[PDB]
C-alpha cells in the first residue's frame, strides 16, 4: 500500500508528497479517509522533489498538512455491467441512491484509450430509432454523436426516455444517462420520472443507468463524470456487443468544467477565456464514442450555445464532432406536435443516398422541400386568403399540412401520462408511408387521420373511425 502526505491545500488543488519513484502516475486516483466518506484526488502534475499536484473530487474544508494520502494504483474506477442499470452513481463510482453497494462484476478505469484506427468501422450506418421525424429527416448515426437542442416546455426528458425504450426493445441495447453539472432538483425529478415511465424498475428489468456529477460538486468532479458514465456505456459495447446509447446533459457544462480546472491549475487561458487544451479535452471524450466491430456507443448530447454565438469556441469545438442534430422547438409544441422536433432545423450528415439508399433520400428531400414552400406561403395566407395560389401550390399546402401532422408520433413511455398506446415505427414503414402520400395517394383522407399515428396502416384504420 503506497502512502503519501499532504503538503499543500489551495481550494480544489491538493499537493501531496511521496517517496522517490514511488509516485502515483498522472491521472491516478488518490484517497483520504474523512469523517464522512472519502476525499478523492486525481493526480494532475509532478511538480518535482517527489511532490504531485492533484485536483480534488470533493470539498477540501478541514484537511490538514501532513495527512495520510493513499495511492489507489490507477485512474478512478467505476462498476460496470448489468448491475449498474437502475442505479445512481457519482463521479467516483459510489452508489448515491441509498440502495447499498453496486455488487458489480468488474470496475474499469474512467480514462481509456479510444479505439485504434485499425479498430475503426469503415461504413457509416443508421441507428433506427422508431421515431418518424428522426429516422426520415435527421437520422442518427450508429456510433455517432447527436446534438439535442431546446430546454423545458418541449418534452426533452420524454424524448430522451423514448430513445432509451426504443433502442432497448428494438435493438436490445441499454443506455447510460450522464448528468454533467446536473441541477440536483432536476436529477431528483428525472429519477422519479424514469420510475413512473418504466425505463427504471427497481424490481423488474431497468433499461438505463444513471450517473450524476451535480453542479455543486467541484470543477474536478464535473469535468470527469462524462467519462465515468461513458465507461459504463463502453463495457456494454466491449463485453456484450450492444448498440448502446449515451446521454450527456449538458455537454457545455463539460467544457466549462474543463475551463475551470485548467484555470485552477495555473494554465494561461486561451481565447475567450477557455482552456488551451479545449480541443484535445473534447477529443479525449468524443473519440471514445464510436462504432467498433463488436457494437457501438451512440451518444445524444444536450448542447447549450453561449450568448447564442454559434462561433464561440465551446460550440465550435463540439460541433466538429456532431454527426447530426435534433431540435425541439416551442414553435413546434405550440402547434400541438409531439415530439416537438423542427423538421427543417434538425439536420443530418447521413441524409445521403450512399448511406440511406436513393429512395429514402428522395422521399425525405421532397418532404423537406414541401415544408419549405409551405413556410414561405404562411405570410400570404395570413393577409390575402387561401384562394390566392396556383393549381400545384394549393395542392401542396394541403399536402404539407398533412405531412406535418404525420410527423407527430405517440410515445410508448408517455402512456402513463397520455392513455394513448405508443407506436414504434420501423424505418421501412416510415419511408413507404411518406412515399405514398408524396405521390398523392391520400388526398381523399381528412387531416385528423394523420395526428398521433404510427404507420400508414394506422392512417387507413383511423380515417374509417372518424367516419363510420
Amino acid at each position: 500500500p503506497i502512502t503519501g502526505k499532504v503538503t499543500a491545500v489551495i481550494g480544489a488543488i491538493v499537493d501531496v508528497h511521496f517517496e522517490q519513484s514511488e509516485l502515483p502516475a498522472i491521472l491516478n486516483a488518490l484517497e483520504i479517509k474523512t469523517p464522512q466518506g472519502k476525499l478523492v484526488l486525481e493526480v494532475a502534475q509532478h511538480l518535482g522533489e517527489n511532490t504531485v499536484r492533484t485536483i480534488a473530487m470533493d470539498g477540501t474544508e478541514g484537511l490538514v498538512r501532513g495527512e495520510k494520502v493513499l495511492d489507489t494504483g490507477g485512474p478512478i474506477s467505476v462498476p460496470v455491467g448489468r448491475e449498474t442499470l437502475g442505479r445512481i452513481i457519482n463521479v467516483i463510482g459510489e452508489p448515491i441512491d441509498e440502495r447499498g453497494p453496486i455488487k458489480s462484476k468488474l470496475r474499469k478505469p474512467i480514462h481509456a484509450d479510444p479505439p485504434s484506427f485499425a479498430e475503426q468501422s469503415t461504413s457509416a450506418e443508421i441507428l433506427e430509432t422508431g421515431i418518424k421525424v428522426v429516422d426520415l429527416l435527421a437520422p442518427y448515426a450508429r456510433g455517432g454523436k447527436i446534438g439535442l437542442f431546446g430546454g423545458a416546455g418541449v418534452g426533452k426528458t420524454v424524448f430522451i426516455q423514448e430513445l432509451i425504450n426504443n433502442i432497448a426493445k428494438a435493438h436490445g441495447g441499454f443506455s447510460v444517462f450522464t448528468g454533467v453539472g446536473e441541477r440536483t432538483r432536476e436529477g431528483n425529478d428525472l429519477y422519479r420520472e424514469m420510475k413512473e415511465t418504466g425505463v427504471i424498475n427497481l424490481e423488474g428489468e431497468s433499461k438505463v443507468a444513471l450517473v450524476f456529477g451535480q453542479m455543486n460538486e467541484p470543477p474536478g468532479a464535473r469535468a470527469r463524470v462524462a467519462l465515468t458514465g461513458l465507461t459504463i456505456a463502453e463495457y456494454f459495447r466491449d463485453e456484450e456487443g450492444q448498440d448502446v446509447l449515451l446521454f450527456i446533459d449538458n455537454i457545455f457544462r463539460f467544457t466549462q468544467a474543463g475551463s475551470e480546472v485548467s484555470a485552477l491549475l495555473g494554465r494561461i487561458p486561451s481565447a475567450v477565456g477557455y482552456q488551451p487544451t479545449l480541443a484535445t479535452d473534447m477529443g479525449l471524450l468524443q473519440e471514445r464514442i464510436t462504432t467498433t466491430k463488436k457494437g457501438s456507443v451512440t451518444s445524444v448530447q444536450a448542447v447549450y450555445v453561449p450568448a447564442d454565438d454559434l462561433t464561440d469556441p465551446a460550440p465550435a469545438t463540439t460541433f466538429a464532432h456532431l454527426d447530426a442534430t435534433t431540435v425541439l422547438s416551442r414553435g413546434i409544441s405550440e402547434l400541438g406536435i409531439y415530439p416537438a422536433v423542427d423538421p427543417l432545423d434538425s439536420k443530418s450528415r447521413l441524409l445521403d443516398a450512399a448511406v440511406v439508399g436513393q429512395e429514402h433520400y428522395d422521399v425525405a428531400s421532397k418532404v423537406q422541400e414541401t415544408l419549405q414552400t409551405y413556410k414561405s406561403l404562411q405570410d400570404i395566407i395570413a393577409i390575402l386568403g387561401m384562394d390566392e395560389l396556383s393549381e400545384q401550390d394549393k395542392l401542396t399546402v394541403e399536402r404539407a399540412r398533412k405531412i406535418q401532422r404525420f410527423l407527430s408520433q405517440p410515445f410508448a413511455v408517455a402512456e402513463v401520462f397520455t392513455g394513448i398506446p405508443g407506436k414504434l415505427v420501423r424505418l421501412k414503414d416510415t419511408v413507404a408511408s411518406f412515399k405514398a402520400v408524396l405521390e398523392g395517394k391520400y388526398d381523399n383522407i381528412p387531416e385528423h387521420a394523420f395526428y398521433m399515428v404510427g404507420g400508414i396502416e394506422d392512417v387507413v384504420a383511423k380515417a374509417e373511425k372518424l367516419a363510420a
Partner: protein, 482 residues
C-alpha cells in the same frame, strides 16, 4: 510551539502570511495577538495564507497567531428571529446575546439527489405579476436580476412583507421564515430596510445578515454561506425558510478580492476558476426535502446586478445557469410606469405551474398568452388595424395596467384571481385605461362588502369549481355595470 501557533512573516492587503500552525485545518479560524480574527485559506509548504476579518493595521510581522480549532461556523435556531447579526452571527442591533439552538458550519453539503421531492407548494409573493406569471415554489431558486435601481430589492422585500398572512397563524407548516442577506450594501441602507420591516410588522419573522460595504472582504464572502445555515435550521426541522442574497454580484466581487490577493490564477474578468462553484455550492443548498426527511424547505431568491442589461457577463451567466429561473426587471418598463418592471418575455420559472395556486393557474393559463401575442403585435400600436389585431391591443393594454402594483402592497391570492379573472375574460375592455387603477381598488372593496363568501372559498379551497366560476362571472358583470 509551532503546531498550534504561528508567527507573522508578512501582512498587507488583509492577507497575513504566517509561519507555523502546522496542525491547522484548511478554512480554519485563527486569532492574532491584537484580537482580530481571520481564516486560513492557503495551506502551503512553508507558510499559511490567512485572510483578515478586520483592518490590517492590527497585525504586524513577528506577531503570534493561535489556532482556534474551528472551521468557520455560526449560531442557528429560532432565537435569531427578529435579529440583525453580522456574517459570524454576532448581534449588531443592540438587543444583547443571541440564543442559539446549536451551531452549524458555513459550509454544508447540499441535500443529495435522493432526499428530495419535486417542488409543489407556492411561495406566494403577493405580486400580481410574479404569482400569476413567474410563480415561485418552496425549494426553488428563482433569481431576481436586472440593472441598478430597477426594483430588485423591492420585489424580494414585498415577498417578505407578504408572508404575514401565514406567519400570524398557528399552522407551522404554512409559515415562511425569512432571511435577508445584505452583502455590501451601505449600513444606512440596511438600517433603512430594517426600519421598514418593523413598520410593517415583518421583523418578527425575519433574520437580517449584514456584511456591509466597509466590512473585510471575507466577511462579505462568508455572509451568504452563513445565512444559508441559519435558514437551513428551519428546512432541517420540517419548517420553511426563504433566503434573499442581496446580492451575489457583490459577493462574487469580495471572493475575487481574496483570490487576487492570495495570488490564485485569475480568469475571465479576473475571477478565480472556482467562482462558479462558489455560487453553485451555495445555491444548491435551497431544496425541498422528501417525506422521510421531514419535508422541510429552503427557497432562494438571489439577486444579481447586471451592467446595461448584459446577461452574458461572467457572473450573470453562472447564476442564470445555476438557478431555476429569472424575474427580469427593466429601466424601460419602470419609467413607462410598469411597476414592478418585470419583463415577462425574458422571465421564467422552470418549476412553473406545480408552484402555483390552482385557482390562479386557471385564470393565469391564458394570461401567459394574451400577453405573449400582445408582445408579437405590440409594434402595431402606431391607425389601420383590423378587428382581430385591435382586440388583442385592447386586452394587452388593460392586462398590463392590471399588473401594475404599488410598493409594499402585496395582494392575497383570493384578491388576485378575481382581478385577473376580470382582465383575462374581457370585463375590463370597456373600462377606459386611466381608470383600471380605481377599478381594482373598488372591485375588491365591493367584493369584500357583498361577496365575502367567494373570496373565502378561493382562499380556503384554492381551486375554482364550475359553480365558483359562475359566481365570479356574475359578481364581475354586476360591478362592471356600475
Amino acid at each position: 510551539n509551532l503546531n498550534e501557533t504561528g508567527r507573522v512573516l508578512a501582512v498587507g492587503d488583509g492577507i497575513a502570511r504566517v509561519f507555523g500552525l502546522n496542525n491547522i485545518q484548511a478554512e480554519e479560524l485563527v486569532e492574532f495577538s491584537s484580537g482580530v480574527k481571520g481564516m486560513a485559506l492557503n495551506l502551503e509548504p512553508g507558510q499559511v495564507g490567512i485572510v483578515l476579518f478586520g483592518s490590517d493595521r492590527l497585525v504586524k510581522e513577528g506577531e503570534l497567531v493561535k489556532r482556534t480549532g474551528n472551521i468557520v461556523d455560526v449560531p442557528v435556531g429560532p432565537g435569531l428571529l427578529g435579529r440583525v447579526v453580522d456574517a459570524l452571527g454576532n448581534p449588531i442591533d443592540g438587543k444583547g446575546p443571541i440564543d442559539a439552538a446549536g451551531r452549524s458550519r458555513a459550509q454544508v453539503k447540499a441535500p443529495g439527489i435522493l432526499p428530495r421531492r419535486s417542488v409543489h407548494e407556492p411561495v406566494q409573493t403577493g405580486l400580481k405579476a410574479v404569482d400569476a406569471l413567474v410563480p415561485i415554489g418552496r425549494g426553488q431558486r428563482e433569481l431576481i436580476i436586472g440593472d441598478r435601481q430597477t426594483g430588485k430589492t423591492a420585489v424580494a422585500l414585498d415577498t417578505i412583507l407578504n408572508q404575514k398572512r401565514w406567519n400570524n397563524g398557528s399552522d407551522e407548516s404554512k409559515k415562511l421564515y425569512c432571511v435577508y442577506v445584505a452583502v455590501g450594501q451601505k449600513r444606512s441602507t440596511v438600517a433603512q430596510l430594517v426600519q421598514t420591516l418593523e413598520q410593517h410588522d415583518a421583523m418578527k419573522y425575519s433574520i437580517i445578515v449584514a456584511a456591509t460595504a466597509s466590512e473585510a472582504a471575507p466577511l462579505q464572502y462568508l455572509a451568504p454561506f452563513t445565512a444559508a445555515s441559519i435558514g437551513e435550521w428551519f428546512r432541517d426541522n420540517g419548517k420553511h425558510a426563504l433566503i434573499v442574497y442581496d446580492d451575489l454580484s457583490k459577493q462574487a466581487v469580495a471572493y475575487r478580492q481574496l483570490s487576487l490577493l492570495l495570488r490564485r490564477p485569475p480568469g475571465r474578468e479576473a475571477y478565480p476558476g472556482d467562482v462558479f462553484y462558489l455560487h453553485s455550492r451555495l445555491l444548491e443548498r435551497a431544496a425541498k426535502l422528501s417525506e422521510k426527511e421531514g419535508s422541510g424547505s429552503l427557497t432562494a431568491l438571489p439577486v444579481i446586478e447586471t451592467q446595461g442589461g448584459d446577461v452574458s457577463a461572467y457572473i450573470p451567466t453562472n447564476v442564470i445557469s445555476i438557478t431555476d429561473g429569472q424575474i427580469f426587471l427593466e429601466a424601460e418598463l419602470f419609467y413607462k410606469g410598469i411597476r414592478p418592471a418585470i419583463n415577462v418575455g425574458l422571465s421564467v420559472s422552470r418549476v412553473g405551474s406545480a408552484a402555483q395556486v390552482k385557482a390562479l393557474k386557471q385564470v393565469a393559463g391564458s394570461l401567459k398568452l394574451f400577453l405573449a401575442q400582445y408582445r408579437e403585435v405590440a409594434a402595431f400600436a402606431q391607425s389601420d388595424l383590423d378587428a382581430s389585431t385591435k382586440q388583442t391591443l385592447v386586452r394587452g393594454e388593460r392586462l398590463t395596467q392590471l399588473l401594475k402594483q404599488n410598493q409594499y402592497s402585496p395582494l392575497a391570492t383570493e384578491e388576485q384571481v378575481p382581478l385577473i379573472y376580470a382582465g383575462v375574460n374581457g370585463h375590463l375592455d370597456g373600462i377606459e385605461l386611466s381608470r383600471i387603477g380605481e377599478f381594482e381598488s373598488s372591485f375588491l372593496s365591493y367584493l369584500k362588502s357583498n361577496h365575502n363568501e367567494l373570496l373565502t372559498e378561493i382562499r380556503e379551497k384554492g381551486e375554482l369549481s364550475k359553480e365558483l366560476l359562475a359566481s365570479l362571472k356574475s359578481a364581475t358583470e354586476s360591478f362592471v355595470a356600475t
